[PDB]
Amino acid sequence: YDIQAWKKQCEELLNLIFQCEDSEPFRQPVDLLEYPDYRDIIDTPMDFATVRETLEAGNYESPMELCKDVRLIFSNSKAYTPSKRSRIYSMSLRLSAFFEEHISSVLSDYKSALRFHKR
């Protein structure tokens, strides 16, 4: 029932994502010089360094907020892909499955801890 445990659990999950070769296109903001029309399609850019920085700044209140930003990285990749068979999109699908598999217990434990706090 540790209400604060999610933060280090998220730091460790982010460390695992950074070690994954599938995260390489998503470690830094999309290069607008290489994809000049990117902001015509994508309203809110997001990447794993921004997520890590937001967490380290103490600007996430809950793992649900972190999860919303990580999910935005994947929906941006799906929205920008010209094909469902593109390399970067295919990497986002595997990385998304890995993320969802690992974030599930973080979300469950935090919500359980908060319910216990308000029992």
Ligand SMILES: COC(=O)Nc1ccc(Cc2ccncc2)cc1
């Ligand atoms: C400096 O790193 C980048 O610019 N990385 C990157 C990440 C996503 C995209 C967008 C995309 C393209 C094709 N399929 C799916 C999504 C482009 C580039």
